[PDB]
Design a protein around this motif. Structure first.
Motif: not given
Ligand code: UBY
Ligand code: CA
Ligand code: CA
Ligand code: CA
Ligand code: CA
Ligand code: ZN
Length: 316
Positions: A121-128, A133-148
Motif C-alpha cells: 500500500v502506497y500513499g501519495d505523500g503530502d508533497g512536503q 512513495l512508490s517512486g523509491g525503488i528502495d521503498v518498494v523493495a522494503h515493503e515487499l521484503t516485509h512480506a518475505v
C-alpha cells in the motif's frame, strides 16, 4: 483478469520513461503475467478501502500525472521479484509465486507505505514530507521484503525482533536498489523524501545517527513509541550490515568489508533458516555467524567480518 500479455509505456514519479507489463482485455490493466502468478497494481482512489480497483487504462500509455505512482509501484515490484528470483532463487514472497498486489493513491496526503498482511500500500505523500512513495525503488523493495519476512522468520513487529524486521527491509531494499543500479546508495527513501530539501533521506544505513537513529546498542531506544522503536533501533542492525558489506572503523572497531553480494547471501540465509518470530539482536548475530559459516567456512574472512561488525555496534 483473463487477457493477453502486452507492453505499455509510461512515466514514473520522477519523470522517467519505462515500459511496463500489462494485460489487454477491453482495457489495458496493470497486470504483469511475466512474473510468477502475476503482479497486479490497483487504484485506491484517495480512499482507504483495499485493494481498490485493478488499474485500467484505455490506451496502454501511462504518462498522466495520476498514472505515475502506479507505473513505479508496478515496475519496481517487478524488479524486486527479479532480485529475489535471480539472486536468491526465491519465487515471490511466499516462495511459491504468490500474486503480488499493490495499491497506490491510498488515502490523502499519506506520508507512508506498508504491507497490510496481504498486499503493498502506497500513499501519495503530502508533497512536503514525501512525494508518492512508490517512486523509491528502495521503498518498494522494503515493503515487499516485509512480506518475505512474514512468510519466513516471522519477526514480531515490536522491540528487538521488530527492529530486525525493519532492518531486513532496509537491507534488502538497498540491495534491490543496487541491483537495479540507478543512483544506488545506503540511504533509505531519498528519491521520494522531502522534495524541497536536497541530499537528505528518511534513514541512513551508513550513518544512522545523521537522522537521529542509534548506531550502537548502548544508544538503543527502549520506550514505547514506534512499536518500541522498530524504525529507530533498526539503525543498529543497518549499521552492522553496512559495515559487513563496505567495511569501516566504528567506535574504534575495524571491520573488513566483504561486499554487497555476500552481505545479501548471509542475511537471506539468516532470515530464512535461522531467525524466528522472537529473535533478538544477540540471536541475529548468532544467526548471521552461523549463516556465514555455512556459506564460507568457520575460518573465513566472511565469518570474521560478521563478528567484527556486530562487535562494532555493541551486539554480542
Ligand atoms: C521505507 C519507508 C519510506 C516506508 C516504511 N514503511 P513501513 O512498511 O515500515 C510502515 N509500517 C507499518 O505501517 O507497520 C504497521 C502495520 C500496518 C499494517 C499491518 C500491520 C502493521 C517506513 O520506514 N515508514 C516509517 C515512516 C514509519 O512508519 O515510521
Ligand atoms: Ca492512458
Ligand atoms: Ca538512490
Ligand atoms: Ca536508497
Ligand atoms: Ca529530500
Ligand atoms: Zn518497514
Amino acid at each position: 483478469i483473463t487477457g493477453t500479455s502486452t507492453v505499455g509505456v509510461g512515466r514514473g514519479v520522477l519523470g522517467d520513461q519505462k515500459n511496463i507489463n500489462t494485460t489487454y482485455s477491453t482495457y489495458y490493466y496493470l497486470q504483469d503475467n511475466t512474473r510468477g502468478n502475476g503482479i497486479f497494481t490497483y487504484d485506491a482512489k484517495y480512499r482507504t478501502t483495499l485493494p481498490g480497483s485493478l488499474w485500467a487504462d484505455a490506451d496502454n500509455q501511462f504518462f498522466a500525472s495520476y498514472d505515475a505512482p502506479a507505473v513505479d509501484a508496478h515496475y519496481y515490484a517487478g524488479v524486486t521479484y527479479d532480485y529475489y528470483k535471480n539472486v536468491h532463487n526465491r519465487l515471490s514472497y511466499d516462495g511459491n509465486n504468490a500474486a503480488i498486489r499493490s495499491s497506490v493513491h491510498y488515502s490523502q496526503g499519506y506520508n507512508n507505505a506498508f504491507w497490510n498482511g496481504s498486499q503493498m500500500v502506497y500513499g501519495d505523500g503530502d508533497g512536503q514530507t514525501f512525494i508518492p512513495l512508490s517512486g523509491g525503488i528502495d521503498v518498494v523493495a522494503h515493503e515487499l521484503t516485509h512480506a518475505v519476512t512474514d512468510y519466513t522468520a516471522g519477526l514480531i513487529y515490536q522491540n528487538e525482533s521488530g527492529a530486525i524486521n525493519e532492518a531486513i527491509s532496509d537491507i534488502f531494499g538497498t540491495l534491490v536498489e543496487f541491483y537495479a543500479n540507478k543512483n544506488p546508495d545506503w540511504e533509505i527513501g531519498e528519491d521520494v523524501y522531502t522534495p524541497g530539501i536536497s541530499g537528505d533521506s528518511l534513514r541512513s544505513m551508513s550513518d544512522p545517527a545523521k537522522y537521529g537513529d542509534p548506531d550502537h546498542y548502548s544508544k538503543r531506544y527502549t520506550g514505547t513509541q514506534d512499536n518500541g522503536g522498530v524504525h529507530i533501533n533498526s539503525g543498529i542492525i543497518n549499521k552492522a550490515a553496512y559495515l559487513i558489506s563496505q567495511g569501516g572503523t566504528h567506535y574504534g572497531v575495524s571491520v573488513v568489508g566483504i561486499g554487497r553480494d555476500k552481505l545479501g547471501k548471509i542475511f537471506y540465509r539468516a532470515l530464512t533458516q535461522y531467525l524466528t518470530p522472537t529473535s533478538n539482536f544477540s540471536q541475529l548475530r548468532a544467526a548471521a555467524v552461523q549463516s556465514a559459516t555455512d556459506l564460507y567456512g568457520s575460518t573465513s574472512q566472511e565469518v570474521a567480518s560478521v563478528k567484527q561488525a556486530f562487535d562494532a555496534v555493541g551486539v554480542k
